[PDB]
Design an enzyme around this catalytic site. Structure first.
Site, PDB file in Angstrom:
ATOM      1  N   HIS A 171       0.976  -1.176   0.061  1.00  0.00           N
ATOM      2  CA  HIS A 171      -0.014   0.000  -0.110  1.00  0.00           C
ATOM      3  C   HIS A 171       0.835   1.111   0.075  1.00  0.00           C
ATOM      4  O   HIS A 171       0.518   2.364  -0.316  1.00  0.00           O
ATOM      5  CB  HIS A 171      -1.025   0.135   1.111  1.00  0.00           C
ATOM      6  CG  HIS A 171      -0.699   0.628   2.363  1.00  0.00           C
ATOM      7  ND1 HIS A 171      -0.724  -0.237   3.506  1.00  0.00           N
ATOM      8  CD2 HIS A 171      -0.241   1.783   2.733  1.00  0.00           C
ATOM      9  CE1 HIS A 171      -0.046   0.619   4.529  1.00  0.00           C
ATOM     10  NE2 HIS A 171       0.012   1.753   4.089  1.00  0.00           N
TER      11      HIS A 171
ATOM     12  N   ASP B 261      -0.396  -7.346   2.431  1.00  0.00           N
ATOM     13  CA  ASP B 261       0.020  -6.157   2.180  1.00  0.00           C
ATOM     14  C   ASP B 261       1.584  -6.218   2.385  1.00  0.00           C
ATOM     15  O   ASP B 261       1.956  -5.998   3.684  1.00  0.00           O
ATOM     16  CB  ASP B 261      -0.555  -5.228   3.156  1.00  0.00           C
ATOM     17  CG  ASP B 261      -0.265  -3.643   3.047  1.00  0.00           C
ATOM     18  OD1 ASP B 261       0.568  -3.263   2.060  1.00  0.00           O
ATOM     19  OD2 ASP B 261      -0.337  -2.977   3.986  1.00  0.00           O
TER      20      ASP B 261
ATOM     21  N   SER C 168       3.781   2.738   8.049  1.00  0.00           N
ATOM     22  CA  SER C 168       3.663   1.410   7.088  1.00  0.00           C
ATOM     23  C   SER C 168       4.941   1.287   6.466  1.00  0.00           C
ATOM     24  O   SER C 168       5.728   2.306   6.114  1.00  0.00           O
ATOM     25  CB  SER C 168       2.623   2.079   6.056  1.00  0.00           C
ATOM     26  OG  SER C 168       1.278   2.165   6.647  1.00  0.00           O
TER      27      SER C 168
END
Ligand SMILES: *[B]([O])([O])[C]([C][C][C][N])[N]C(=O)[C]1[C][C][C]N1C(=O)[C]([C]C1=[C][C]=[C][C]=[C]1)[N]C([C])=O
EC number: 3.4.21.5
Lengths: 249, 7, 26
Positions: free
Chosen positions: A43, A99, A197
């Protein structure tokens, strides 16, 4: 990171920064797994809903960093990418299931006091450590509150029971994810946030005293919200995929 | 932005 | 390889300020 502290010097030699040319800004966190490979959350590069879709040309990797925004002169090494590999079955549509993405640097970095690869888990390992109650560690240069740190932050959070995780959100949680963080009636707090992230969730093996990447910062509803928990890509579960891309390429 | 130019 | 062994800690037998927290949970 929220409710963490300043990382010690050379505490996360594997920590990497995803950085974009124009506009110069921090995309995400990442980890160094070998001299030519970096592992981040998909992502970070692909997210249609936000029209996010980065190609090798838009990114730089910044390894061996401490200061978030300073160009650490004779310490950091900035790398360009050759190729990016997103997992064919990453579900950006529904729940960021799978992910994970792999990056191939154009040239292998040389290790040093600040740059050093982390270990990928093995069945025995993941089996011994991925236990509710067990503590792991996330690092990043992300948001401090749901402003920014001058320096890399760190926090140690516990692995939470699958059920609890499930009952914490409306999102459909899979086998490729695990949640971590403190429960509301425990006292301590902390979590990852925007700009974290792609970063690693690491545990130190009590057996060989080596550091392993058990997870990747994936998602969460806000930051350090009570009765909420952080979500991570279960790296062991996706290992054969990684291997495969390492093999193939 | 908050960032220092790179070489 | 020589993975997960930090030049500045493990390689020198030096512990970080909070690594013990982790180990005490295991
Ligand atoms: B990362 O720094 O980019 C960040 C880390 C977790 C923040 N504690 N991840 C995100 O913001 C991800 C990427 C886009 C949506 N997202 C979320 O965490 C959503 C929840 C979600 C989960 C699955 C599919 C779609 C959305 N949470 C929020 C508060 O927006």
């Amino acid at each position: 990171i929220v409710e963490g502290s300043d990382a010690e010097i050379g505490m996360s030699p594997w920590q990497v920064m995803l950085f974009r040319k124009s506009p110069q800004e921090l995309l995400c966190g990442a980890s160094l797994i070998s001299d030519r490979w970096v592992l981040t959350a998909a992502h970070c590069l692909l997210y249609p809903p936000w029209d996010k879709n980065f190609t090798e040309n838009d990114l730089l990797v910044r390894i061996g960093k401490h200061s978030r925004t300073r160009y650490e002169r004779n310490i950091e090494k900035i790398s360009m990418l050759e190729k990016i590999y997103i997992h064919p079955r990453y579900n950006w549509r529904e729940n960021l299931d799978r992910d994970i993405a792999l990056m191939k640097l154009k040239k292998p970095v040389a290790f040093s006091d600040y740059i050093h690869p982390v270990c990928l888990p093995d069945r025995e390992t993941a089996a011994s450590l991925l236990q509710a109650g067990y503590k792991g560690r996330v690092t990043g240069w992300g948001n401090l509150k749901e402003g920014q740190p001058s320096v890399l932050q760190v926090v140690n959070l516990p692995i939470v029971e699958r059920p609890v995780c499930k009952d914490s959100t409306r999102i459909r949680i899979t086998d490729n994810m695990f949640c971590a963080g403190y429960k509301p009636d425990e006292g301590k707090r902390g979590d990852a946030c925007e700009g974290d992230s792609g970063g690693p969730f690491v545990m130190k093996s009590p057996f060989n005293n080596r550091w392993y990447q058990m997870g990747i910062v994936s998602w969460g509803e806000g930051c350090d919200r009570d009765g909420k928990y952080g979500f991570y890509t279960h790296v062991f579960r996706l290992k054969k995929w990684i291997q495969k891309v390492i093999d193939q390429f | 932005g908050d960032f220092e130019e790179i070489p | 390889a020589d993975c997960g062994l930090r030049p500045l800690f493990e390689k020198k037998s030096l512990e970080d300020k909070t690594e013990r927290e982790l180990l005490e949970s295991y």
